[PDB]
Design a protein around this ligand. Structure first.
Ligand SMILES: OC[C@H]1O[C@@H](O[C@@H]2[C@@H](O)[C@@H](O)O[C@H](CO)[C@H]2O)[C@H](O)[C@@H](O)[C@@H]1O
Ligand SMILES: OC[C@H]1O[C@H](O)[C@H](O)[C@@H](O)[C@@H]1O
Ligand SMILES: [Ca+2]
Length: 263
């Protein structure tokens, strides 16, 4: 298959000698836990990357709230023109991350989620290196789950490095089919060790990316902590077959995040 550059085909499970080090169960309705999550508003004025169309609203229950035991990130077609950091965007959405609060070097990450559909929507569950000194894409980024809702049953798992990234079409990725990802929950899983990453759905790794063992940061920048990111972008990749006005509002629901690490 054309762009499968990091194929996987093996089971994944929480190793027996790993412990739970961090979780959000999202069982307390209201605002996300401020000891666990912060809002990224860093590019609201300038505009987000990837020709994205959304404004990411902080402190707005209409975009980001915990209810019925899930985190909800909801896209809306509206101009939040009263925000000081407004960048002319036609849509609102949310982006949460654990940056500065919680980060991990190696481990087993599980995110149970139901995804946001409608042509335009680009839900993501991903990580970035806590030390961004080398910039993107050198620092290393981990896409545990991306979906673009013009192809809503296709789940993409991808890593980006300096040598291996989407700007030069060398990203290391795979994809699999999941049943109705916007109408039912699935478990999106990362098993990250010093020697390889597995990315999967419901216990099956469809992606594997190996440490080449050359000690080259350009091919393996993953020996340092990564923080977790939950977002629903609009346009860019999500807009390849257009943005449908009728598709707003749309939500991604996250039942839980669980992170495990070797004891
Ligand atoms: O903001 C850091 C970096 O993000 C890129 O896009 C990422 C993509 O590389 C991958 O990691 O998936 C996530 C979630 O779908 C995208 O936001 C941008 O291409 C880049 O310009 C930016 O520096
Ligand atoms: O356009 C950016 C997207 O491009 C790709 O095809 C990658 O798999 C994905 O991780 C990235 O976010
Ligand atoms: Ca829950």
């Amino acid at each position: 298959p054309e762009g499968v550059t990091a194929p996987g085909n093996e089971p994944m499970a929480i190793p027996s000698d790993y412990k739970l080090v961090w979780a959000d169960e999202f069982n307390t309705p209201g605002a996300p836990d401020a000891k666990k999550w912060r809002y990224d508003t860093s590019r609201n004025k300038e505009g987000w990357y990837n020709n994205e169309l959304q404004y990411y609203a902080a402190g707005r229950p209409e975009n980001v709230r915990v209810e019925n035991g899930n985190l909800v990130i909801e896209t809306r077609k509206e101009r939040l023109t009263s925000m000081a950091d407004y960048g002319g965007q036609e849509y609102s959405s949310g982006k949460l991350f654990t940056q500065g609060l919680a980060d991990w070097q190696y481990g087993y990450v599980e995110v149970r989620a139901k995804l946001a559909c409608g042509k335009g929507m680009w839900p993501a569950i991903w990580m970035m290196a806590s030390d961004g000194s080398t910039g993107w894409p050198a620092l290393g980024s981990i896409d545990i789950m991306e979906m673009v809702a013009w192809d809503p049953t296709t789940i993409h798992g991808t890593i980006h490095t300096k040598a291996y990234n989407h700007v030069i079409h060398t990203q290391k990725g795979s994809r699999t089919t999941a049943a109705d990802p916007c109408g039912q929950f699935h478990t999106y899983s990362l098993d990250w060790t010093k020697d390889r990453m597995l990315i999967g759905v419901d216990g099956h790794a469809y992606m594997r990316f190996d440490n080449d063992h050359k000690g080259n940061h350009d091919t393996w920048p993953f020996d340092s902590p990564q923080y977790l990111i939950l977002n629903v972008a609009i346009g860019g990749w999500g807009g390849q077959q257009g943005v449908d006005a009728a598709a707003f509002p749309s939500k991604m629901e996250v039942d839980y995040v669980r992170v495990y690490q070797k004891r």
